[PDB]
Amino acid sequence: MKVEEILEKALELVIPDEEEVRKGREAEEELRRRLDELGVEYVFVGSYARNTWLKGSLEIDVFLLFPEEFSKEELRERGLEIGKAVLDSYEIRYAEHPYVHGVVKGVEVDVVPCYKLKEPKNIKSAVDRTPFHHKWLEGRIKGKENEVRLLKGFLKANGIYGAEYKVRGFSGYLCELLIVFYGSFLETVKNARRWTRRTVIDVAKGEVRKGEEFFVVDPVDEKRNVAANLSLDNLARFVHLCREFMEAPSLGFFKPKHPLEIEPERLRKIVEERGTAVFAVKFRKPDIVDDNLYPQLERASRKIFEFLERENFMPLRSAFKASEEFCYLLFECQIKEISRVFRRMGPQFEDERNVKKFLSRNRAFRPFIENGRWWAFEMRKFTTPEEGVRSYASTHWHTLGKNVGESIREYFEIISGEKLFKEPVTAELCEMMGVKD
Amino acid sequence: MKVEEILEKALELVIPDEEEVRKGREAEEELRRRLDELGVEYVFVGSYARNTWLKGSLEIDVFLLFPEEFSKEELRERGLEIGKAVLDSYEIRYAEHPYVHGVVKGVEVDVVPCYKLKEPKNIKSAVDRTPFHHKWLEGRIKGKENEVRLLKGFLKANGIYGAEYKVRGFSGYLCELLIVFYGSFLETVKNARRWTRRTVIDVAKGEVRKGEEFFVVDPVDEKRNVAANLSLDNLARFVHLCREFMEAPSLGFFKPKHPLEIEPERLRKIVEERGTAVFAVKFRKPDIVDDNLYPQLERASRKIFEFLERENFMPLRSAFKASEEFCYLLFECQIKEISRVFRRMGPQFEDERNVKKFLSRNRAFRPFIENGRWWAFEMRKFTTPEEGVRSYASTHWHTLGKNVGESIREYFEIISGEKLFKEPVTAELCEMMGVKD
Numbered sequence A, B: 001m002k003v004e005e006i007l008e009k010a011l012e013l014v015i016p017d018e019e020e021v022r023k024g025r026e027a028e029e030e031l032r033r034r035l036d037e038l039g040v041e042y043v044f045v046g047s048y049a050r051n052t053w054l055k056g057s058l059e060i061d062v063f064l065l066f067p068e069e070f071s072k073e074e075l076r077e078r079g080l081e082i083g084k085a086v087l088d089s090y091e092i093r094y095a096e097h098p099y100v101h102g103v104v105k106g107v108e109v110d111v112v113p114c115y116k117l118k119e120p121k122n123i124k125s126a127v128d129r130t131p132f133h134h135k136w137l138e139g140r141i142k143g144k145e146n147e148v149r150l151l152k153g154f155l156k157a158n159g160i161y162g163a164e165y166k167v168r169g170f171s172g173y174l175c176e177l178l179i180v181f182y183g184s185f186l187e188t189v190k191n192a193r194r195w196t197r198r199t200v201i202d203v204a205k206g207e208v209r210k211g212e213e214f215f216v217v218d219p220v221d222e223k224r225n226v227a228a229n230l231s232l233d234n235l236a237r238f239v240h241l242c243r244e245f246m247e248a249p250s251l252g253f254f255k256p257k258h259p260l261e262i263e264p265e266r267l268r269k270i271v272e273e274r275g276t277a278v279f280a281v282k283f284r285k286p287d288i289v290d291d292n293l294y295p296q297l298e299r300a301s302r303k304i305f306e307f308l309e310r311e312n313f314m315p316l317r318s319a320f321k322a323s324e325e326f327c328y329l330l331f332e333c334q335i336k337e338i339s340r341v342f343r344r345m346g347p348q349f350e351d352e353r354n355v356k357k358f359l360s361r362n363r364a365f366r367p368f369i370e371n372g373r374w375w376a377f378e379m380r381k382f383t384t385p386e387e388g389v390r391s392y393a394s395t396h397w398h399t400l401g402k403n404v405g406e407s408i409r410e411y412f413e414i415i416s417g418e419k420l421f422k423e424p425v426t427a428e429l430c431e432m433m434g435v436k437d
């Protein structure tokens, strides 16, 4: 409908609505009042402070700013003192080191203790950069606020907004850096069509160059890759989305896909036509945070995938899902059944001692020589990938993540067929198999 | 029963019987008469001449010896003149270049034209060494004649006597060299326990050393590996037989195994228990000599084996058989059925042009990105190894040997199950699967 018109139409999917902006204003002012009354020195940072926050993602970030001469725990203990005092309700969250998260007049707030540093060149971790992030952006982003929200909204609609591990996409800081660097959403999208996995965007130098990996240089700290948590595949997906958008722009790119919602019968028929084995490992979800859980699910699912490959079941793809009480590791394999008999490798013919040992063992079939080396027919203890994974998960739970593996130790189930389709996994299955509408 | 006693008992399985020795004497004398009457200059060479020939393998080798100054075809045309004159019946065989084979008083004879060379250092091919082979052995082998027959008999009972391609075992000349080098059958057997695939036996130097491959240096020509046609696997099998013999000597090692002669029902059950796909390619045997046929069958069977591996049917082993009118290429595979769906590799995400092409094609399922690269689900045109090989043999017969492939072009059949067990292949199947007694 013309790019420029679509972008105007997208601004309403993306700009927070009426009651939301004033909900923030009312929380912010009340928070100021409570802080001011305590004589606390602070700064509101992040996307609230710069009016760059996406529709529906209202959260206030406050950094408490304490004089340089308070020790490491003097900032930690005194910092947590104020968060409790100033929030209606609160939890003690753990990013890299302890901070406070809580609520004020219905609005999410994070309070973080950090040093009040005159100029950077003084950085222990992420926390101490953050005031400088805001400082750097404040007023380079003025005027371009809706460009940021357009980019956030594009990425969110497409499942790649956020650097948390469940997503491995783009952070807010990265989105604002990009807008500063290219000037607009549209220009970011046009130029990202030519990004590669070796693209280095150096914001402070106004430069793009090649490096070893995708790297967005923090203007506040040259060693920091702002895009560190962006996965290779989400970068790929973004580059492709940018190419598709420019070739045929649409409002559709700013609206989340309403999921496939398929009936078990249609999935049964798809699985039939593909001729694969589709199954899942079901187990209880351990009570750990997403940033801990999802890396473990990834590892568990990889280790099982690798086991399936090794055992010649020819896995096609895998996926995983956490509901509220259970986790599922989903697999599709090209081999439903393998022969009972296999070939075991023995020694070179020259090696008399080891040959004697190899031939000592009783077997149903006679070993043989092939290309200078002994081989034996021996018998598998499983012939389906489901039986293999029951064995593997029973015996090798210790490699499947600390908490995921411990859970699988207490209880797991392999589910196939119509029973699999009763579990809340049908969407993940459809995506794994590339099912169309 | 004591080695020394077993060896005495083996001498009767190995020394030609009464009517055979005199059958040879009568043929030899008659052959001399016919040659002498023509004024031909000749020498009886080979195992008849040295009384080293195995029981049942009576054949007379004559070399016609012509003065140095006759051109290449002067020896070829004049040489074939005498073979026709002197044999009762004859064929014109083709070794490296044309010679005569025929019969005299019931006995096989080969007549070969060669130069009468005073001292070697004058060699164009194999033919011109041969008089020198006999010369070298004549009287180094005197006294050790039965040692040779013991070794030939050992190898024959175990299917590895003869350098023709059907066998890829030990030639007669190689057996006599070995006996000269070690002094006896028993010592040959004791020392061969330590042969490796890098063992070089240098007969004329009285030396054993390491080289790049198993090499037995012709005492008559240092460049010639007398063991050139011995396969790696037959060398392995011989080394192992030598170790087994010395550990528990028996007359059994000089008697051919009477074959397994199994009933189809037992084979059906074995195949069931292994859980494999067992099948054969059947086609008409081309009318070519064994030394041409067997290398082609080997190549055909390898190419099909390699196709099966490539297509993920996980072949275990293969074998082949020629009867009088048909050939069979036998296969056993671990996968009886593979899924219809597979993964096709596409381009890296960066490569816009090629990605557009990859995604242009209509497919039932959506392509996806994994590890920086596009992939598509696509559909196999076959899901069993039998269907695969029907396709492969129909389309790629041109790589399956000149004559074997041409035959398969005119007609082939894939046979599985109870029908397979009707063909004269049950022995080869039993051996391929390592079936016991």
Ligand SMILES: Nc1ncnc2c1ncn2[C@@H]1O[C@H](COP(=O)(O)OP(=O)(O)OP(=O)(O)O)[C@@H](O)[C@H]1O
Binding pocket: A045, A046, A047, A048, A052, A053, A054, A057, A059, A061, A095, A096, A112, A126, A127, A130, A133, A134, A171, A172, A173
């Ligand atoms: N571990 C952490 N603890 C405290 N602050 C962090 C931490 N990690 C990053 N930060 C900084 O805090 C600031 C706000 O972070 P946040 O992820 O909330 O970004 P945002 O710009 O406010 O975007 P969003 O709209 O998604 O909330 C950023 O400058 C960021 O660098």
Ligand SMILES: Nc1ncnc2c1ncn2[C@@H]1O[C@H](COP(=O)(O)OP(=O)(O)OP(=O)(O)O)[C@@H](O)[C@H]1O
Binding pocket: A303, A307, A310, A396, A398, A399
């Ligand atoms: N490279 C491979 N080749 C052949 N077998 C392998 C290979 N890697 C692993 N295995 C076999 O698979 C088993 C399990 O491997 P895996 O890494 O999934 O589990 P693990 O618990 O991490 O390993 P482990 O039990 O050896 O400590 C190993 O114990 C080994 O016998």
Ligand SMILES: Nc1ncnc2c1ncn2[C@@H]1O[C@H](COP(=O)(O)OP(=O)(O)OP(=O)(O)O)[C@@H](O)[C@H]1O
Binding pocket: B045, B046, B047, B048, B052, B053, B054, B057, B059, B061, B095, B096, B112, B126, B127, B130, B133, B134, B171, B172, B173
């Ligand atoms: N292509 C050939 N044409 C003619 N002579 C050959 C050819 N190849 C090898 N020879 C030689 O002819 C001689 C006899 O060969 P042959 O294979 O018959 O051996 P043998 O000692 O007589 O054993 P056997 O008892 O198995 O017949 C050997 O010295 C051998 O080197």
Ligand SMILES: Nc1ncnc2c1ncn2[C@@H]1O[C@H](COP(=O)(O)OP(=O)(O)OP(=O)(O)O)[C@@H](O)[C@H]1O
Binding pocket: B303, B307, B310, B396, B398, B399
């Ligand atoms: N290395 C491999 N990796 C993937 N595909 C292969 C490979 N080798 C062969 N192929 C595929 O298998 C087909 C047949 O291979 P094969 O060598 O058995 O028959 P060919 O008649 O000798 O080959 P061609 O038809 O290519 O001349 C090839 O045409 C090719 O598409």
Ligand SMILES: [Cl-]
Binding pocket: A173, A218, A224, A225, A226
């Ligand atoms: Cl960052």
Ligand SMILES: [Cl-]
Binding pocket: B173, B218, B224, B225, B226
């Ligand atoms: Cl030779």
Ligand SMILES: [Mg+2]
Binding pocket: A046, A059, A060, A061, A110
């Ligand atoms: Mg926040």
Ligand SMILES: [Mg+2]
Binding pocket: A059, A101, A108, A109, A110
């Ligand atoms: Mg928060």
Ligand SMILES: [Mg+2]
Binding pocket: B046, B059, B060, B061, B110
């Ligand atoms: Mg002969």
Ligand SMILES: [Mg+2]
Binding pocket: B059, B101, B108, B109, B110
């Ligand atoms: Mg002959």
Ligand SMILES: [Mn+2]
Binding pocket: A046, A047, A048, A059, A061, A172
């Ligand atoms: Mn924020």
Ligand SMILES: [Mn+2]
Binding pocket: A395, A396, A397, A398, A399
């Ligand atoms: Mn383990």
Ligand SMILES: [Mn+2]
Binding pocket: B046, B047, B048, B059, B061, B172
């Ligand atoms: Mn001979």
Ligand SMILES: [Mn+2]
Binding pocket: B395, B396, B397, B398, B399
């Ligand atoms: Mn071909």
Ligand code: NA
Binding pocket: A390, A391, A392, A394, A395
């Ligand atoms: Na197990």
Ligand code: NA
Binding pocket: B390, B391, B392, B394, B395
């Ligand atoms: Na074909």
